[model samples]
Target: APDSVDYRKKGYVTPVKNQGQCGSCWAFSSVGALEGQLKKKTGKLLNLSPQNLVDCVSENDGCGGGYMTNAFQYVQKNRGIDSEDAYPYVGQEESCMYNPTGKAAKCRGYREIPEGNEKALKRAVARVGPVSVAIDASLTSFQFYSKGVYYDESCNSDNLNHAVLAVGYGIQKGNKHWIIKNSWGENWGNKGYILMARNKNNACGIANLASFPKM
Candidate 1:
């Protein structure tokens, strides 16, 4: 595999978005992967609605917490996900208000990396597209993450909580890391992104629940 790859620089990754105060990071992470797949297929990047997944996906906990796999399954079942312009995010749980006319992208299926396999996860991100992943974001440092590679020893791989997207991977001066996309908005992290430690025993559980939407 190559030493580094960046989908954002390749035009497949979309602009950073905010999930606000809601615990809808799972929805955002799922949609972020879908958007990358959509762009890769059609060369057109469109913002898919997290609100649709947040409210419509019954298997997931709306504004409580959720998994990216469940969100992808909901999109696959629903045929496609509506655009953000049609069903905008309210940052909180609300009744499902879906309109097929507003459908923007389709998720034929999804694929997950094996548990704790950072090698497979890195290969997938380099070859497939942006991937949705759950990580341990319980630490306050993750909340106020600034620039530079972030490697917290206290982060537990088994305690994956916040869901985000792994958009790319690279080595910064021998310090390998995964470029992650956060839904906490651009105001947080580095323009709504973070560089988590890679090849560091799957730092923060990034590979444990890594998956991506297939167009």
Candidate 2:
């Protein structure tokens, strides 16, 4: 049975579709979480493209790397992002110029997770909805992950490459966990989302998160 967690209150939700292997985890997770929150609040799921964020958002290091907070600030300062159809997902494309003639997108909502606040992190879910978070991608299971409920922590310290969204929190098979959606393709871990050990801070400092509500 799932826990008594109030997902709606916490803002646990889903977002628009995003492509994988773009190395733009920062942009992808950031917009993905926001899309989920906006949908939860307004029942309108807008397919905001990470490619737009990746291309227009200056200072990003392309798919090679970027921080979650950086992506949030980019959207907040610039307005919002464009649809994938407009920008199209090109995986690890280089950052480019921002089209002044194009519409500026803005996030309806957003939130930040302090370092090492496990309780606060979970609470943020209930308060703001789904959030995009960063985690160590060096896990062995993640390297060749095909599919399954992942529960290994041996490689937490090596988590240096992936980004995902925290859609919801729950307990399964006698273990408390965070319902995290990944970008490693559907054939990857747990159809994309992996159940990491919750409360135990499996995603502590590594979980750089944010959400877009609706502007």
Candidate 3:
């Protein structure tokens, strides 16, 4: 319950990524959380491949949207995931090219924060590591977020349309916000990050579908 928590500043976060024009954001969010746990465990940060999940996780959609929980299950069943260098992202879904020899990290399983519980989500980000969270990123405010805390009441928790990673939290001028890691690339948001309103009944469904890998 510190005043603030940021895994990026702690060196547990990887460089921001881009999901391109694809709806493969779920893959990015899933790998982002996994990469953070792997870093926290081994002090090693590797750019794991989101394309692996995009191309391989059959339980979920390829680029038409998916779930991080399913992605974690696929990784766990596959033993480990490959690095980005081994299977680069092509935005669109392609044939599965999974290679065990290209594996970079492994995930034991995953844990989900209680639905509609922001406090539990905070604990997950602050205590566990980075967490995968889904949110309502279908509004103009979300699509064009550049700087400062993004507070939009128009976005509903039940209207979650995109998945992102909750890497940290902080209070700016009495405004409690969660530092979100997006997959829209560095040119989007605050260098591929956004400060979304927090403690506002799980603003934008951030805590509704939150989860993280168990490395």
Candidate 4:
């Protein structure tokens, strides 16, 4: 896919988000893709609020656990996601305080890639925007990821558990990788980014159920 791609360099991918001590990876996953897609469609970078979904969305579990698709549905029903400045993240499940602002971004819908295909995911990220995906981030090796193409034999797609954004695709040192952005803050995993194994049996469930906002 173009040999390599970087949405961050294109100024489409938004700033990295921190989910803190909560299980709000779904929020970050959905919002991350939404931010990129909205920028692609409208040419405006938006810092959509995952906190709003974490607190207000009733279709899914707030902080305990949830699906990225459910979060996207919530955004569609709400007309749009309020900006982070208006509904900032508190790192915990708190009461919803959604004060809509004019700076918020809206989406038309979302599109899901056929599960378990890394090539489909590659095209989705390059043609669409950032993709929201679930992975096995429960492992300790993933928790402290610093750099390079992260490939752990312990990781598998059969038991996906966490959500994140696949922003771009690139090769490092000779190995192809997927440039991922996590919700664990910029202090973790390559300044809040991860280069995971791509086009290789869908390592870490990254392509299990990937999708992006239609924006």
**Which residue pairs overlap in candidate 4's backbone?**
none
Model 1, span 1-215: residue lDDT tens: 78888988898877888887888989999999999999889889988899999999999999998888998898999998999999998998988889999999888888989999999998898898888899999998897788789999999999988999898999888899999988877788888889999999889888898898777
lDDT of each: 0.90, 0.63, 0.91, 0.84
The local distance difference test score of model 4 is 0.84
Highest-lDDT candidate: 3
Candidate 4 positional error at 34, Å: 0.9
Segments in model 3 whose C-alpha atoms lie over 4 Å from true places: none
Worst 10 residues of 2 by lDDT: 7-16
- Candidate 1: which stretches are off by over 4 Å? none
How much lDDT does candidate 3 score?
A: 0.91
In candidate 1, position 71 carries an lDDT of: 89
Q: Rank candidates by lDDT, best first.
A: 3, 1, 4, 2
Candidate 4: regions farther than 4 A off: none
Q: How big is the positional error of residue 7 in model 2, measured in Å on the Cα after superposition?
A: 7.1
- Return whichever of 3 and 4 wins on lDDT: 3
Write down the RMSD of candidate 3 (Cα, Å). 0.9
* Model 4 lDDT, residue 205, Cα: 88
Report clashes for each candidate as comma-separated counts. Answer: 0, 19, 0, 0
